[PDB]
Protein backbone atom coordinates (compact mmCIF):
# COMPACT_ATOMS: atom_id res chain seq x y z
CA UNK A 1 0.00 0.00 0.00
CA UNK A 2 1.71 3.13 1.33
CA UNK A 3 4.05 3.79 4.21
CA UNK A 4 4.18 7.32 5.59
CA UNK A 5 7.32 8.30 3.64
CA UNK A 6 5.78 7.51 0.27
CA UNK A 7 2.43 8.92 1.39
CA UNK A 8 4.01 12.33 1.91
CA UNK A 9 5.73 12.25 -1.47
CA UNK A 10 2.44 11.38 -3.20
CA UNK A 11 0.44 13.83 -1.09
CA UNK A 12 2.93 16.55 -1.96
CA UNK A 13 2.75 15.75 -5.68
CA UNK A 14 -1.03 15.52 -5.71
CA UNK A 15 -1.48 18.92 -4.05
CA UNK A 16 1.13 20.60 -6.24
CA UNK A 17 -0.56 19.31 -9.39
CA UNK A 18 -4.12 20.25 -8.20
CA UNK A 19 -3.79 23.87 -6.99
CA UNK A 20 -6.98 25.72 -5.97
CA UNK A 21 -8.98 22.46 -6.02
CA UNK A 22 -10.88 21.49 -2.88
CA UNK A 23 -9.98 17.89 -2.04
CA UNK A 24 -11.98 16.06 0.66
CA UNK A 25 -10.00 14.39 3.40
CA UNK A 26 -11.83 11.12 2.68
CA UNK A 27 -10.25 11.12 -0.78
CA UNK A 28 -6.74 10.99 0.71
CA UNK A 29 -7.86 8.71 3.54
CA UNK A 30 -9.28 6.15 1.13
CA UNK A 31 -6.31 6.53 -1.19
CA UNK A 32 -3.64 5.73 1.42
CA UNK A 33 -5.78 3.38 3.56
CA UNK A 34 -5.21 5.53 6.63
CA UNK A 35 -7.28 7.40 9.19
CA UNK A 36 -8.43 10.94 8.51
CA UNK A 37 -6.51 12.03 11.61
CA UNK A 38 -3.27 10.62 10.22
CA UNK A 39 -3.95 12.42 6.92
CA UNK A 40 -4.55 15.69 8.78
CA UNK A 41 -1.15 15.49 10.48
CA UNK A 42 0.55 14.74 7.16
CA UNK A 43 -1.23 17.87 5.87
CA UNK A 44 0.17 19.82 8.85
CA UNK A 45 3.76 18.94 7.90
CA UNK A 46 3.18 19.76 4.22
CA UNK A 47 1.65 23.05 5.35
CA UNK A 48 4.57 24.16 7.52
CA UNK A 49 7.10 23.11 4.88
CA UNK A 50 5.18 24.88 2.08
CA UNK A 51 5.08 28.06 4.18
CA UNK A 52 8.71 27.87 5.33
CA UNK A 53 9.95 27.22 1.79
CA UNK A 54 7.75 29.88 0.17
CA UNK A 55 5.86 27.34 -1.95
CA UNK A 56 2.37 28.23 -0.74
CA UNK A 57 -0.22 27.42 1.89
CA UNK A 58 -2.80 24.72 2.63
CA UNK A 59 -6.28 25.93 3.52
CA UNK A 60 -8.56 23.55 5.40
CA UNK A 61 -12.24 24.28 4.77
CA UNK A 62 -14.23 22.63 7.58
CA UNK A 63 -17.35 20.56 7.16
CA UNK A 64 -18.39 17.40 5.37
CA UNK A 65 -18.36 19.30 2.06
CA UNK A 66 -14.92 20.59 3.01
CA UNK A 67 -11.35 19.39 2.69
CA UNK A 68 -7.95 20.84 1.81
CA UNK A 69 -6.89 23.28 -0.92
CA UNK A 70 -3.33 24.02 -1.97
CA UNK A 71 -2.80 27.74 -2.75
CA UNK A 72 0.41 28.81 -4.55
CA UNK A 73 1.87 31.90 -2.92
CA UNK A 74 5.09 33.87 -3.31
CA UNK A 75 6.97 35.59 -0.51
CA UNK A 76 7.66 39.30 -0.90
CA UNK A 77 11.38 38.56 -0.63
CA UNK A 78 11.40 36.14 -3.57
CA UNK A 79 9.11 38.51 -5.47
CA UNK A 80 11.29 41.64 -5.43
CA UNK A 81 14.52 39.67 -5.91
CA UNK A 82 12.99 38.00 -8.98
CA UNK A 83 11.59 41.26 -10.34
CA UNK A 84 14.98 42.88 -9.75
CA UNK A 85 16.76 40.18 -11.77
CA UNK A 86 14.11 40.41 -14.49
CA UNK A 87 14.53 44.17 -14.78
CA UNK A 88 18.32 43.87 -14.90
CA UNK A 89 18.07 41.52 -17.90
CA UNK A 90 15.53 43.76 -19.59
CA UNK A 91 17.91 46.68 -19.03
CA UNK A 92 20.25 45.31 -21.74
CA UNK A 93 20.47 47.95 -24.54
CA UNK A 94 20.89 45.18 -27.13
CA UNK A 95 17.13 44.76 -26.72
CA UNK A 96 16.42 48.17 -28.27
CA UNK A 97 14.50 47.91 -31.55
CA UNK A 98 13.53 50.46 -34.24
CA UNK A 99 10.69 52.64 -33.02
CA UNK A 100 11.64 52.46 -29.35
CA UNK A 101 10.50 48.86 -28.84
CA UNK A 102 12.08 46.42 -26.38
CA UNK A 103 12.87 42.81 -27.34
CA UNK A 104 11.42 40.59 -24.61
CA UNK A 105 10.34 37.46 -26.48
CA UNK A 106 13.33 35.46 -25.29
CA UNK A 107 12.08 36.11 -21.74
CA UNK A 108 8.45 35.19 -22.44
CA UNK A 109 9.84 31.88 -23.73
CA UNK A 110 12.01 30.64 -20.85
CA UNK A 111 10.17 28.10 -18.65
CA UNK A 112 11.78 29.08 -15.35
CA UNK A 113 10.92 32.75 -15.89
CA UNK A 114 7.33 32.12 -16.97
CA UNK A 115 6.54 29.89 -14.00
CA UNK A 116 7.69 32.58 -11.57
CA UNK A 117 5.77 35.38 -13.28
CA UNK A 118 2.74 33.09 -13.36
CA UNK A 119 3.20 32.19 -9.71
CA UNK A 120 3.57 35.87 -8.77
CA UNK A 121 0.34 36.72 -10.61
CA UNK A 122 -1.46 33.77 -9.03
CA UNK A 123 -0.12 34.71 -5.61
CA UNK A 124 -1.45 38.28 -5.81
CA UNK A 125 -4.91 37.28 -7.16
CA UNK A 126 -5.15 34.03 -5.14
CA UNK A 127 -8.14 35.12 -3.04
CA UNK A 128 -10.27 36.69 -5.75
CA UNK A 129 -12.94 34.66 -7.51
CA UNK A 130 -11.54 34.02 -10.99
CA UNK A 131 -13.37 31.86 -13.52
CA UNK A 132 -11.00 32.47 -16.44
CA UNK A 133 -7.77 34.18 -17.44
CA UNK A 134 -7.94 36.35 -20.56
CA UNK A 135 -5.33 37.92 -22.84
CA UNK A 136 -5.03 39.12 -26.43
CA UNK A 137 -2.80 37.40 -28.99
CA UNK A 138 0.03 37.07 -29.23
CA UNK A 139 2.77 37.73 -26.65
CA UNK A 140 0.47 37.83 -23.64
CA UNK A 141 -0.42 34.13 -24.18
CA UNK A 142 2.57 32.53 -22.40
CA UNK A 143 1.97 34.76 -19.35
CA UNK A 144 -1.75 34.00 -19.37
CA UNK A 145 -1.10 30.26 -19.34
CA UNK A 146 1.49 30.39 -16.56
CA UNK A 147 -0.89 32.35 -14.36
CA UNK A 148 -3.87 30.15 -15.24
CA UNK A 149 -2.10 26.86 -14.46
CA UNK A 150 -1.43 27.96 -10.86
CA UNK A 151 -5.00 29.27 -10.58
CA UNK A 152 -6.56 26.15 -12.20
CA UNK A 153 -8.74 28.12 -14.63
CA UNK A 154 -9.20 28.11 -18.41
CA UNK A 155 -7.46 30.63 -20.64
CA UNK A 156 -9.41 32.72 -23.16
CA UNK A 157 -7.52 34.33 -26.04
CA UNK A 158 -8.82 37.54 -27.59
CA UNK A 159 -7.93 37.76 -31.29
CA UNK A 160 -7.21 40.87 -33.32
CA UNK A 161 -8.25 39.09 -36.52
CA UNK A 162 -11.76 38.11 -37.49
CA UNK A 163 -9.91 35.77 -39.83
CA UNK A 164 -10.65 32.94 -37.48
CA UNK A 165 -12.67 29.74 -37.77
CA UNK A 166 -14.19 29.00 -34.36
CA UNK A 167 -17.91 29.62 -34.67
CA UNK A 168 -19.85 32.79 -34.03
CA UNK A 169 -17.86 35.72 -32.69
CA UNK A 170 -18.41 39.04 -30.96
CA UNK A 171 -16.18 41.96 -31.90
CA UNK A 172 -15.69 45.46 -30.59
CA UNK A 173 -13.64 48.42 -31.73
CA UNK A 174 -11.08 50.18 -29.57
CA UNK A 175 -8.47 52.93 -29.81
CA UNK A 176 -4.89 52.04 -29.09
CA UNK A 177 -2.70 55.02 -28.37
CA UNK A 178 -0.44 54.11 -31.29
CA UNK A 179 -2.10 53.98 -34.52
CA UNK A 180 -4.88 56.16 -33.27
CA UNK A 181 -6.57 53.92 -35.79
CA UNK A 182 -9.60 52.04 -34.54
CA UNK A 183 -8.59 48.39 -34.49
CA UNK A 184 -10.93 45.49 -33.80
CA UNK A 185 -10.70 42.61 -31.32
CA UNK A 186 -12.95 39.60 -31.18
CA UNK A 187 -13.91 36.57 -29.12
CA UNK A 188 -15.88 33.43 -29.88
CA UNK A 189 -19.28 33.48 -28.19
CA UNK A 190 -18.80 29.83 -27.16
CA UNK A 191 -15.41 30.44 -25.50
CA UNK A 192 -16.68 32.24 -22.40
CA UNK A 193 -19.70 31.77 -20.18
CA UNK A 194 -21.58 35.00 -19.53
CA UNK A 195 -21.20 36.36 -16.01
CA UNK A 196 -17.68 34.97 -15.55
CA UNK A 197 -15.07 36.74 -13.42
CA UNK A 198 -12.07 37.40 -15.66
CA UNK A 199 -8.46 38.02 -14.72
CA UNK A 200 -6.84 40.01 -17.55
CA UNK A 201 -3.15 39.34 -18.24
CA UNK A 202 -0.97 41.06 -20.80
CA UNK A 203 2.70 41.43 -21.62
CA UNK A 204 2.73 45.19 -21.94
CA UNK A 205 0.61 48.28 -21.31
CA UNK A 206 1.22 51.89 -22.25
CA UNK A 207 -1.84 54.11 -21.83
CA UNK A 208 -4.03 51.01 -21.68
CA UNK A 209 -6.05 51.13 -24.89
CA UNK A 210 -5.81 47.39 -25.50
CA UNK A 211 -6.78 46.45 -21.95
CA UNK A 212 -9.66 48.94 -21.97
CA UNK A 213 -10.79 47.31 -25.22
CA UNK A 214 -10.78 43.96 -23.44
CA UNK A 215 -12.92 45.51 -20.67
CA UNK A 216 -15.53 46.72 -23.15
CA UNK A 217 -15.47 43.31 -24.82
CA UNK A 218 -16.32 41.74 -21.48
CA UNK A 219 -19.44 43.96 -21.24
CA UNK A 220 -20.76 42.17 -24.35
CA UNK A 221 -20.55 38.97 -22.29
CA UNK A 222 -21.92 40.53 -19.07
CA UNK A 223 -18.60 39.42 -17.54
CA UNK A 224 -16.61 41.12 -14.77
CA UNK A 225 -12.92 41.95 -14.52
CA UNK A 226 -11.66 40.32 -11.32
CA UNK A 227 -8.17 41.78 -11.78
CA UNK A 228 -5.60 43.13 -14.21
CA UNK A 229 -1.99 41.96 -14.41
CA UNK A 230 0.70 43.33 -16.71
CA UNK A 231 4.35 42.40 -16.97
CA UNK A 232 5.57 45.82 -18.15
CA UNK A 233 3.91 49.24 -18.01
CA UNK A 234 5.21 52.26 -19.90
CA UNK A 235 5.56 55.60 -18.13
CA UNK A 236 -3.84 56.05 -18.69
CA UNK A 237 -7.41 55.01 -19.51
CA UNK A 238 -7.29 51.98 -17.19
CA UNK A 239 -8.40 51.49 -13.58
CA UNK A 240 -6.67 49.16 -11.09
CA UNK A 241 -3.86 47.01 -12.49
CA UNK A 242 -0.82 45.17 -11.06
CA UNK A 243 2.50 45.65 -12.87
CA UNK A 244 5.86 44.01 -12.25
CA UNK A 245 8.02 46.47 -14.16
CA UNK A 246 7.97 50.10 -15.28
CA UNK A 247 9.69 51.13 -18.51
CA UNK A 248 10.90 54.68 -19.08
CA UNK A 249 10.80 55.54 -22.79
CA UNK A 250 13.82 54.35 -24.75
CA UNK A 251 16.11 57.30 -25.39
CA UNK A 252 16.87 56.10 -28.92
CA UNK A 253 19.94 58.35 -29.18
CA UNK A 254 21.83 57.31 -26.03
CA UNK A 255 20.80 53.64 -26.44
CA UNK A 256 19.58 53.38 -22.87
CA UNK A 257 16.89 51.20 -21.32
CA UNK A 258 15.89 52.42 -17.86
CA UNK A 259 13.56 50.13 -15.90
CA UNK A 260 12.35 50.22 -12.28
CA UNK A 261 9.92 48.29 -10.12
CA UNK A 262 6.20 48.26 -10.82
CA UNK A 263 3.45 48.72 -8.28
CA UNK A 264 3.49 45.04 -7.32
CA UNK A 265 4.82 45.63 -3.77
CA UNK A 266 1.53 47.38 -2.91
CA UNK A 267 0.00 43.88 -3.04
CA UNK A 268 2.37 42.27 -0.50
CA UNK A 269 1.46 44.11 2.71
CA UNK A 270 1.72 42.30 6.05
CA UNK B 1 17.79 22.30 8.82
CA UNK B 2 14.86 19.96 8.15
CA UNK B 3 13.63 16.79 9.73
CA UNK B 4 13.04 13.86 7.39
CA UNK B 5 9.35 14.68 6.79
CA UNK B 6 9.91 18.28 5.69
CA UNK B 7 12.90 17.14 3.65
CA UNK B 8 10.77 14.73 1.63
CA UNK B 9 8.18 17.45 0.94
CA UNK B 10 10.79 20.03 -0.11
CA UNK B 11 12.77 17.45 -2.11
CA UNK B 12 9.62 16.42 -3.98
CA UNK B 13 8.73 20.04 -4.73
CA UNK B 14 12.26 20.87 -5.81
CA UNK B 15 12.50 17.92 -8.19
CA UNK B 16 9.04 18.54 -9.65
CA UNK B 17 9.97 22.15 -10.41
CA UNK B 18 13.43 21.34 -11.87
CA UNK B 19 12.79 18.51 -14.36
CA UNK B 20 15.60 17.46 -16.73
CA UNK B 21 18.20 19.30 -14.57
CA UNK B 22 21.14 17.30 -13.26
CA UNK B 23 21.29 18.30 -9.59
CA UNK B 24 24.45 17.36 -7.65
CA UNK B 25 23.87 15.42 -4.44
CA UNK B 26 26.02 18.05 -2.72
CA UNK B 27 23.46 20.75 -3.52
CA UNK B 28 20.95 18.97 -1.31
CA UNK B 29 23.52 18.38 1.45
CA UNK B 30 24.20 22.10 1.82
CA UNK B 31 20.48 22.75 1.38
CA UNK B 32 19.24 20.48 4.17
CA UNK B 33 22.40 20.30 6.34
CA UNK B 34 22.51 16.50 6.30
CA UNK B 35 24.67 13.68 4.96
CA UNK B 36 24.52 12.42 1.40
CA UNK B 37 23.70 9.07 3.02
CA UNK B 38 20.44 10.46 4.37
CA UNK B 39 19.62 12.28 1.13
CA UNK B 40 20.26 9.15 -0.91
CA UNK B 41 17.78 7.33 1.30
CA UNK B 42 15.19 10.01 0.51
CA UNK B 43 15.92 9.91 -3.23
CA UNK B 44 15.33 6.17 -3.04
CA UNK B 45 11.87 6.67 -1.53
CA UNK B 46 10.99 9.43 -3.98
CA UNK B 47 12.19 7.21 -6.83
CA UNK B 48 9.98 4.31 -5.77
CA UNK B 49 6.96 6.58 -5.30
CA UNK B 50 7.46 8.49 -8.54
CA UNK B 51 7.64 5.16 -10.36
CA UNK B 52 4.73 3.47 -8.58
CA UNK B 53 2.48 6.52 -9.04
CA UNK B 54 3.36 7.23 -12.69
CA UNK B 55 4.98 10.60 -11.97
CA UNK B 56 8.33 9.78 -13.58
CA UNK B 57 11.78 8.33 -13.04
CA UNK B 58 14.47 9.58 -10.72
CA UNK B 59 17.78 8.82 -12.45
CA UNK B 60 20.87 8.77 -10.22
CA UNK B 61 24.19 9.09 -12.06
CA UNK B 62 27.27 8.46 -9.88
CA UNK B 63 30.47 10.46 -9.90
CA UNK B 64 31.52 13.98 -9.00
CA UNK B 65 30.14 15.23 -12.34
CA UNK B 66 26.91 13.28 -11.76
CA UNK B 67 23.99 13.58 -9.38
CA UNK B 68 20.20 13.25 -9.57
CA UNK B 69 17.78 14.03 -12.42
CA UNK B 70 13.98 13.99 -12.47
CA UNK B 71 12.47 12.92 -15.80
CA UNK B 72 8.69 13.32 -16.22
CA UNK B 73 7.33 10.11 -17.69
CA UNK B 74 3.83 8.87 -18.38
CA UNK B 75 2.87 5.23 -18.13
CA UNK B 76 1.18 3.65 -21.15
CA UNK B 77 -2.05 2.88 -19.26
CA UNK B 78 -2.52 6.52 -18.29
CA UNK B 79 -1.73 7.56 -21.87
CA UNK B 80 -4.23 5.07 -23.33
CA UNK B 81 -6.99 6.13 -20.92
CA UNK B 82 -6.39 9.87 -21.21
CA UNK B 83 -6.27 9.75 -25.00
CA UNK B 84 -9.44 7.65 -25.18
CA UNK B 85 -11.07 10.12 -22.79
CA UNK B 86 -9.93 13.08 -24.88
CA UNK B 87 -10.98 11.33 -28.08
CA UNK B 88 -14.55 10.70 -27.01
CA UNK B 89 -15.09 14.26 -25.76
CA UNK B 90 -13.80 15.62 -29.08
CA UNK B 91 -16.23 13.37 -30.99
CA UNK B 92 -19.05 15.66 -29.81
CA UNK B 93 -21.19 16.72 -32.81
CA UNK B 94 -21.48 20.29 -31.48
CA UNK B 95 -17.77 20.86 -32.27
CA UNK B 96 -18.38 20.90 -36.04
CA UNK B 97 -17.95 24.28 -37.69
CA UNK B 98 -18.78 25.56 -41.19
CA UNK B 99 -16.28 24.23 -43.71
CA UNK B 100 -15.71 20.94 -41.87
CA UNK B 101 -13.59 22.42 -39.09
CA UNK B 102 -13.66 21.07 -35.52
CA UNK B 103 -13.78 23.43 -32.54
CA UNK B 104 -10.81 22.69 -30.24
CA UNK B 105 -10.49 26.06 -28.52
CA UNK B 106 -12.01 24.94 -25.23
CA UNK B 107 -9.89 21.78 -24.90
CA UNK B 108 -6.69 23.66 -25.82
CA UNK B 109 -7.63 26.06 -23.05
CA UNK B 110 -8.15 23.92 -19.96
CA UNK B 111 -5.10 23.69 -17.66
CA UNK B 112 -5.58 20.06 -16.60
CA UNK B 113 -5.85 18.80 -20.19
CA UNK B 114 -2.77 20.77 -21.24
CA UNK B 115 -0.62 19.48 -18.39
CA UNK B 116 -1.40 15.89 -19.45
CA UNK B 117 -0.87 16.49 -23.18
CA UNK B 118 2.33 18.35 -22.37
CA UNK B 119 3.45 15.51 -20.09
CA UNK B 120 2.59 12.97 -22.75
CA UNK B 121 4.72 14.81 -25.33
CA UNK B 122 7.54 15.19 -22.80
CA UNK B 123 7.38 11.54 -21.89
CA UNK B 124 7.68 10.32 -25.49
CA UNK B 125 10.52 12.74 -26.38
CA UNK B 126 12.19 12.61 -22.95
CA UNK B 127 15.35 10.86 -24.14
CA UNK B 128 15.98 13.04 -27.21
CA UNK B 129 18.35 16.00 -27.42
CA UNK B 130 16.21 19.14 -27.50
CA UNK B 131 17.17 22.77 -27.14
CA UNK B 132 13.84 24.44 -27.85
CA UNK B 133 10.18 23.73 -28.59
CA UNK B 134 8.75 25.45 -31.67
CA UNK B 135 5.16 26.08 -32.76
CA UNK B 136 3.08 28.39 -34.98
CA UNK B 137 0.83 31.07 -33.61
CA UNK B 138 -1.75 30.76 -32.24
CA UNK B 139 -3.48 27.59 -31.01
CA UNK B 140 -0.34 25.45 -30.86
CA UNK B 141 1.13 27.85 -28.31
CA UNK B 142 -0.57 26.28 -25.25
CA UNK B 143 0.57 22.77 -26.19
CA UNK B 144 4.08 23.98 -26.90
CA UNK B 145 4.46 25.68 -23.51
CA UNK B 146 2.94 22.70 -21.71
CA UNK B 147 5.46 20.33 -23.30
CA UNK B 148 8.37 22.77 -22.88
CA UNK B 149 7.73 23.17 -19.14
CA UNK B 150 8.11 19.44 -18.56
CA UNK B 151 11.21 19.36 -20.80
CA UNK B 152 12.67 22.61 -19.37
CA UNK B 153 13.48 24.24 -22.71
CA UNK B 154 12.49 27.61 -24.17
CA UNK B 155 9.59 28.06 -26.56
CA UNK B 156 9.90 29.69 -29.98
CA UNK B 157 6.78 30.91 -31.82
CA UNK B 158 6.71 31.09 -35.62
CA UNK B 159 4.50 33.94 -36.84
CA UNK B 160 2.27 33.70 -39.89
CA UNK B 161 2.72 37.44 -40.00
CA UNK B 162 5.83 39.31 -40.88
CA UNK B 163 4.17 42.41 -39.36
CA UNK B 164 5.79 41.64 -36.10
CA UNK B 165 8.24 44.03 -34.46
CA UNK B 166 10.87 41.86 -32.81
CA UNK B 167 13.89 42.79 -34.87
CA UNK B 168 15.40 41.21 -37.94
CA UNK B 169 13.37 38.26 -39.22
CA UNK B 170 13.83 35.33 -41.58
CA UNK B 171 10.76 34.45 -43.65
CA UNK B 172 9.91 31.58 -45.97
CA UNK B 173 6.90 30.64 -48.05
CA UNK B 174 5.00 27.38 -47.97
CA UNK B 175 1.83 25.92 -49.40
CA UNK B 176 -0.94 24.71 -47.17
CA UNK B 177 -3.22 22.16 -48.61
CA UNK B 178 -6.10 24.59 -48.09
CA UNK B 179 -5.72 27.78 -49.79
CA UNK B 180 -3.26 26.30 -52.20
CA UNK B 181 -2.11 29.87 -51.84
CA UNK B 182 1.51 30.34 -50.87
CA UNK B 183 1.46 31.78 -47.37
CA UNK B 184 4.48 33.13 -45.36
CA UNK B 185 5.85 32.22 -41.93
CA UNK B 186 8.65 34.15 -40.26
CA UNK B 187 11.00 33.79 -37.31
CA UNK B 188 13.12 36.43 -35.58
CA UNK B 189 16.85 35.87 -35.99
CA UNK B 190 17.72 36.53 -32.34
CA UNK B 191 15.09 33.98 -31.24
CA UNK B 192 17.00 30.87 -32.30
CA UNK B 193 20.63 29.76 -32.13
CA UNK B 194 22.25 28.13 -35.17
CA UNK B 195 22.33 24.34 -35.07
CA UNK B 196 19.52 24.05 -32.46
CA UNK B 197 17.71 20.73 -32.03
CA UNK B 198 14.06 21.73 -32.29
CA UNK B 199 10.99 19.81 -31.20
CA UNK B 200 8.00 20.92 -33.31
CA UNK B 201 4.60 20.89 -31.54
CA UNK B 202 1.29 21.69 -33.23
CA UNK B 203 -2.39 21.24 -32.49
CA UNK B 204 -3.59 19.90 -35.83
CA UNK B 205 -2.03 18.41 -38.98
CA UNK B 206 -3.77 17.49 -42.25
CA UNK B 207 -1.37 17.31 -45.20
CA UNK B 208 1.62 18.61 -43.26
CA UNK B 209 2.38 21.73 -45.29
CA UNK B 210 2.47 23.96 -42.23
CA UNK B 211 4.82 21.58 -40.43
CA UNK B 212 6.82 21.21 -43.64
CA UNK B 213 6.97 25.00 -43.76
CA UNK B 214 8.44 24.99 -40.23
CA UNK B 215 11.05 22.39 -41.20
CA UNK B 216 12.08 24.45 -44.23
CA UNK B 217 12.32 27.48 -41.99
CA UNK B 218 14.67 25.57 -39.67
CA UNK B 219 17.21 25.07 -42.47
CA UNK B 220 17.60 28.84 -42.84
CA UNK B 221 18.94 28.50 -39.27
CA UNK B 222 20.70 25.19 -39.94
CA UNK B 223 18.63 23.71 -37.12
CA UNK B 224 17.61 20.07 -36.77
CA UNK B 225 14.22 18.45 -36.23
CA UNK B 226 14.51 16.64 -32.88
CA UNK B 227 10.92 15.46 -33.16
CA UNK B 228 7.43 16.34 -34.29
CA UNK B 229 4.31 16.05 -32.13
CA UNK B 230 0.70 16.85 -33.00
CA UNK B 231 -2.50 16.62 -31.00
CA UNK B 232 -4.68 15.66 -34.00
CA UNK B 233 -3.80 14.29 -37.44
CA UNK B 234 -6.24 13.98 -40.35
CA UNK B 235 -6.48 10.82 -42.44
CA UNK B 236 -4.33 11.00 -45.57
CA UNK B 237 1.39 13.40 -46.36
CA UNK B 238 4.56 15.38 -47.11
CA UNK B 239 5.99 14.83 -43.61
CA UNK B 240 8.42 12.23 -42.23
CA UNK B 241 8.30 10.85 -38.67
CA UNK B 242 5.68 12.47 -36.18
CA UNK B 243 3.70 11.49 -33.14
CA UNK B 244 -0.05 12.11 -32.95
CA UNK B 245 -2.54 11.39 -30.18
CA UNK B 246 -5.80 11.55 -32.14
CA UNK B 247 -7.01 10.88 -35.67
CA UNK B 248 -10.05 12.81 -37.09
CA UNK B 249 -12.15 11.39 -39.91
CA UNK B 250 -13.57 14.21 -42.04
CA UNK B 251 -16.74 15.76 -40.66
CA UNK B 252 -19.71 14.44 -42.59
CA UNK B 253 -21.39 17.86 -42.58
CA UNK B 254 -24.65 16.13 -43.62
CA UNK B 255 -24.99 13.64 -40.73
CA UNK B 256 -23.69 15.88 -37.96
CA UNK B 257 -20.99 13.37 -37.01
CA UNK B 258 -17.39 13.58 -35.80
CA UNK B 259 -15.54 10.27 -35.95
CA UNK B 260 -12.22 10.11 -34.10
CA UNK B 261 -9.83 7.31 -33.13
CA UNK B 262 -6.39 6.93 -31.59
CA UNK B 263 -3.22 8.33 -33.17
CA UNK B 264 0.14 6.59 -33.57
CA UNK B 265 1.38 7.46 -30.08
CA UNK B 266 1.35 3.85 -28.78
CA UNK B 267 4.33 3.01 -30.99
CA UNK B 268 6.56 5.12 -28.69
CA UNK B 269 5.79 2.94 -25.65
N1 LIG C 1 9.23 50.24 -26.06
C1 LIG C 1 8.32 49.10 -26.05
N2 LIG C 1 6.91 49.30 -26.36
C2 LIG C 1 5.99 48.13 -26.34
C3 LIG C 1 6.43 46.88 -26.04
N3 LIG C 1 5.39 46.05 -26.11
C4 LIG C 1 4.30 46.78 -26.45
N4 LIG C 1 4.71 48.05 -26.58
C5 LIG C 1 3.87 49.00 -26.91
O1 LIG C 1 2.97 49.41 -25.77
C6 LIG C 1 1.85 49.74 -26.33
C7 LIG C 1 0.71 48.94 -25.78
O2 LIG C 1 -0.12 49.81 -25.07
P1 LIG C 1 -1.71 49.86 -25.50
O3 LIG C 1 -2.44 48.86 -24.64
O4 LIG C 1 -1.83 49.46 -26.95
O5 LIG C 1 -2.38 51.36 -25.27
P2 LIG C 1 -2.16 52.72 -26.19
O6 LIG C 1 -2.96 52.74 -27.47
O7 LIG C 1 -2.63 53.90 -25.36
O8 LIG C 1 -0.70 52.90 -26.50
C8 LIG C 1 2.09 49.46 -27.96
O9 LIG C 1 2.86 50.61 -28.44
P3 LIG C 1 1.89 51.79 -28.99
O10 LIG C 1 1.68 52.87 -27.95
O11 LIG C 1 0.58 51.08 -29.23
O12 LIG C 1 2.54 52.42 -30.37
P4 LIG C 1 4.11 52.87 -30.59
O13 LIG C 1 4.60 53.61 -29.37
O14 LIG C 1 4.94 51.63 -30.82
O15 LIG C 1 4.20 53.77 -31.80
C9 LIG C 1 2.84 48.50 -28.02
O16 LIG C 1 3.49 48.48 -29.37
C10 LIG C 1 7.90 46.66 -25.71
O17 LIG C 1 8.30 45.58 -25.45
N5 LIG C 1 8.79 47.78 -25.73
N1 LIG D 1 -11.62 19.92 -39.70
C1 LIG D 1 -10.59 20.77 -39.13
N2 LIG D 1 -9.44 21.15 -39.94
C2 LIG D 1 -8.38 22.02 -39.37
C3 LIG D 1 -8.46 22.48 -38.09
N3 LIG D 1 -7.38 23.22 -37.85
C4 LIG D 1 -6.62 23.23 -38.97
N4 LIG D 1 -7.26 22.48 -39.89
C5 LIG D 1 -6.76 22.30 -41.10
O1 LIG D 1 -5.56 21.38 -41.04
C6 LIG D 1 -4.75 21.82 -41.97
C7 LIG D 1 -3.44 22.18 -41.38
O2 LIG D 1 -2.55 21.13 -41.63
P1 LIG D 1 -1.28 21.40 -42.65
O3 LIG D 1 -0.01 21.35 -41.84
O4 LIG D 1 -1.44 22.76 -43.28
O5 LIG D 1 -1.23 20.23 -43.80
P2 LIG D 1 -1.35 20.46 -45.44
O6 LIG D 1 -0.58 21.69 -45.85
O7 LIG D 1 -0.81 19.23 -46.14
O8 LIG D 1 -2.78 20.63 -45.83
C8 LIG D 1 -5.49 23.15 -42.66
O9 LIG D 1 -6.43 22.67 -43.70
P3 LIG D 1 -5.86 22.06 -45.13
O10 LIG D 1 -5.18 20.74 -44.92
O11 LIG D 1 -4.84 23.02 -45.69
O12 LIG D 1 -7.12 21.82 -46.17
P4 LIG D 1 -8.70 21.59 -45.71
O13 LIG D 1 -8.90 20.19 -45.18
O14 LIG D 1 -9.09 22.58 -44.64
O15 LIG D 1 -9.60 21.75 -46.91
C9 LIG D 1 -6.17 23.63 -41.76
O16 LIG D 1 -7.28 24.45 -42.34
C10 LIG D 1 -9.67 22.09 -37.23
O17 LIG D 1 -9.76 22.48 -36.12
N5 LIG D 1 -10.69 21.25 -37.78
Numbering used by the authors:
A (entry chain A): 2 to 236, 241 to 275
B (entry chain B): 2 to 237, 241 to 273
Task: Give me lines lifted from the publication on this model.
PurR is a transcription regulator in bacteria with the major role of repressing the transcription of genes responsible for de novo synthesis of IMP, the common precursor to the purine nucleotides ATP and GTP. B. subtilis PurR comprises two domains, an N-terminal winged helix-turn-helix domain for DNA binding and a C-terminal effector binding domain. In contrast to E. coli PurR whose effector binding domain binds purine bases and is structurally similar to a ribose binding protein, the Firmicute PurR effector binding domain is similar to the phosphoribosyltransferase (PRT) class of enzymes. However, the PRT domain on PurR lacks enzymatic activity and serves a purely regulatory role by binding PRPP to de-repress transcription.
We next solved a co-structure of ppGpp bound to B. subtilis PurR to 2.45 Å resolution. In the structure of the B. subtilis PurR-ppGpp complex, ppGpp binds to the PRT domain in a pocket defined by three loops found in all PRT proteins (II, III, IV; loop numbering from PRT enzymes). The guanine ring of ppGpp is engaged in π-stacking interactions, sandwiched between the aromatic side chains of residues Phe205 and Tyr102. The 5′-phosphates of ppGpp nestle into a pocket formed by loop III and an α-helix, where the backbone amides of loop III and the side chain of Thr211 coordinate the 5′-phosphates. The 3′-phosphates extend upward and out of the binding pocket, where they interact with backbone amides of loop II and the side chains of Tyr102 and Lys207. While (p)ppGpp is commonly co-crystallized with divalent cations (e.g. Mg2+ or Mn2+), we did not find evidence for metals in our structure. A loop that bridges the monomer-monomer interface of a PurR dimer is unresolved in apo PurR but is resolved in ppGpp-bound PurR, suggesting that ppGpp binding stabilizes the conformation of this loop. The effect of this change is that ppGpp significantly alters the electrostatics of the effector binding domain by creating a positively charged channel different from the apo protein. The ppGpp binding site partially overlaps the PRPP binding site, as seen in an overlay of ppGpp and the PRPP analog, cPRPP, bound to PurR. PurR Tyr102 is flipped away from the pocket with PRPP bound and covers the guanine ring with ppGpp bound.
